[PDB]
From a paper:
We have identified a polyclonal [name] cell population that can recognise the microbial glycolipid α-GlcADAG presented by [name]. Here, using α-GlcADAG-loaded [name] tetramers, we characterise a population of type II [name] cells that are selectively reactive to the α-GlcADAG Ag presented by [name] and do not recognise α-GalCer. Thus, this study defines how a microbial-Ag is recognised by a type II [name] TCR, and demonstrates that type II [name] TCRs can bind with diverse docking modes to [name]–Ag.
Interestingly, the Vα11Jα9-Vβ8.2 TCR (designated clone name: A11B8.2) was detected in 12 out of 16 sorted clones. As these [name] TCRs displayed non-germline-encoded residues in both the CDR3α and CDR3β regions, this suggests that these T cells had expanded in vivo prior to their isolation. Of particular interest, the type II [name] cell-derived Vα11Jα9-Vβ8.2 TCR+ line (A11B8.2) was clearly labelled by [name]–α-GlcADAG tetramer (~20× higher than CD1-endo tetramer MFI). In contrast, [name]–α-GalCer tetramer or [name]–sulfatide tetramers failed to provide staining of this cell line above [name]–endo tetramers, highlighting that α-GlcADAG is indeed the preferred ligand for the A11B8.2 TCR. The type II [name] TCR (A11B8.2) bound to [name]–α-GlcADAG with Kd value of 14.6 μM, which was ~2-fold higher affinity than that observed for [name]-endo (Kd = 33.4 μM). Binding of this TCR to [name]–α-GalCer could also be detected, although with a much lower affinity (Kd = 66.5 μM). Notably, none of the variants lacking the uronic acid on the glycosidic group was able to elicit responses by the A11B8.2 [name] TCR+ cell line nor allow [name]-tetramer staining, highlighting a high degree of specificity of the A11B8.2 TCR towards the glucuronic acid. To gain insight into the mode of recognition of the A11B8.2 TCR for [name] presenting a microbial α-linked glycolipid Ag; we determined the crystal structure of the unligated TCR and the A11B8.2 TCR–[name]–α-GlcADAG ternary complex to 1.7 and 3.0 Å resolution, respectively.
Author numbering:
A (entry chain A): 3 to 126, 129 to 145, 149 to 186
B (entry chain B): 5 to 245
Write the structure that this text describes.
């Protein structure tokens, strides 16, 4: 394809660095890098006609002759999660998009203590919470539902934690046999 | 760059107009659609006021540039394949820069029938005493269920103010019936606070879910409530227990 992005997906830990790559099939006039967060907004990170640019913890390089562009992230923060798009302008002056690199930033869990808790409804359906597991844990799995994990940041305590939820209407469902 | 509407539900065969407005006095305006495995693809563009040009994938769409500021995308006969997120952009060709400036996007859902549109049911689940006793932290869970289409915006409000820490929402909604076409969706979110904050009965917790559904202009003659764009909430007061 005219604009190729590598890797398709990336997992990294908070505080780590990573370099994203973008390769072109033809001579490009310029490159534009974007971050698309969970809110769906396309945020311009860089516009380059040549050379290198810095933007906070990000750095980008464009080399028209060698047909590539890179995007570097230093000291990854949870806010860096999202899809990173590379788009380049051809000699026909049209902006062509890559299919994006999906980046997920994981916390470094200080004291892992995987635990399953039962929560009841505030009103008069049962809910199970799986929490405090390390970021290497993958949450798997008809009348039962299990979500993917998410990281929350209790900034008031400088504390981060992972969690997933399971629920069911079925009578035979218990939190002991949920995750 | 601004776009209107930000969300729209349309029926197969209906007419849809997406509007874009820029205040940059840029000669060029563009309409894209975003789809998984395709990035953003150009539909129509305009190299100046009064004129429009076909992009890479123009079929099924028309464009209108009635002024320097406005660029509209028209779907004369909406089809389900036109369900997508649409982005408008502007660019300045007078200078040397090829940079483009993007709108916030419009989420469009084209359905065969509006009877498949449902707002969420929302419920808040109070913290486990076992979590409180072991960690001196308290996690509340919000569950939004039975909604269609899949886009909602969930937020937590504590003592009448939106909170921006101690929260996380599932990356994607899940299908309540994965085998089924037109399956309704579920989404959960967590709010974690200190045990002493949760235990204070002066503290109020509310989970709010913004749902985007039908508009005022859509016809509705069914028995159940019209599934218009609305906010569905569930709340809980803190308690010592």
């Amino acid at each position: 394809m005219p604009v190729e992005q590598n890797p398709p997906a990336l997992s990294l830990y908070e505080g780590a660095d990573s370099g994203l790559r973008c390769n072109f099939s033809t001579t490009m006039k310029s490159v534009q890098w974007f971050q698309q967060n969970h809110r769906g907004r396309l945020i311009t990170l860089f516009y380059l006609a040549q050379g290198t640019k810095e933007n906070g913890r990000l750095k980008s390089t464009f080399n028209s002759k060698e047909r590539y562009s890179t995007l570097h992230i230093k000291d990854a923060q949870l806010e860096d999660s999202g899809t990173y798009f590379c788009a380049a302008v051809n000699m026909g002056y049209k902006l062509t998009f890559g299919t994006g690199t999906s980046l997920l930033v994981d916390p470094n869990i200080q004291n892992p203590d995987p635990a399953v808790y039962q929560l009841r409804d505030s009103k008069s359906k049962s809910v199970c919470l799986f929490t405090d597991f390390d970021s290497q844990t993958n949450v798997s799995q008809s009348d039962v539902y299990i979500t993917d994990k998410c990281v929350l940041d209790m900034r008031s305590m400088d504390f981060k934690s992972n969690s997933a939820v399971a629920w069911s209407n079925k009578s035979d469902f218990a939190c002991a046999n949920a995750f | 760059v601004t776009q209107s509407p930000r969300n729209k539900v349309a029926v197969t065969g209906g007419k849809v107009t997406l509007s874009c407005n820029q205040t940059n006095n840029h000669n060029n305006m563009y309409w894209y659609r975003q789809d998984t495995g395709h990035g953003l693809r150009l539909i129509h563009y305009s190299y100046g006021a009064g004129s429009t040009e076909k992009g890479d994938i123009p079929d099924g769409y028309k464009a209108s540039r009635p002024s320097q500021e406005n660029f509209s995308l028209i779907l004369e006969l909406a089809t389900p394949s036109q369900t997508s997120v649409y982005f408008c952009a502007s660019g300045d060709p007078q200078g040397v820069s090829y940079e483009q400036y993007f709108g916030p996007g419009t989420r469009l859902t084209v359905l065969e029938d509006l009877k498949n549109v449902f707002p969420p049911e929302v419920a808040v689940f109070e913290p486990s005493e076992a979590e409180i006793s072991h960690t001196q932290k308290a996690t509340l869970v919000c569950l939004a269920t039975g909604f269609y289409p899949d886009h909602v915006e969930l937020s937590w409000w504590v003592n009448g103010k939106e909170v921006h820490s101690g929260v996380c929402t599932d990356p994607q909604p899940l299908k309540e019936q994965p085998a089924l076409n037109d399956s309704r969706y579920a989404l959960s979110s967590r709010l974690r606070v200190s045990a002493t904050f949760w235990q204070n009965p002066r503290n109020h917790f509310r989970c709010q879910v913004q749902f985007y559904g039908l508009s005022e202009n859509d016809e509705w003659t069914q028995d159940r409530a019209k599934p218009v764009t609305q906010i569905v909430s569930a709340e809980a007061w803190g308690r010592a227990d």
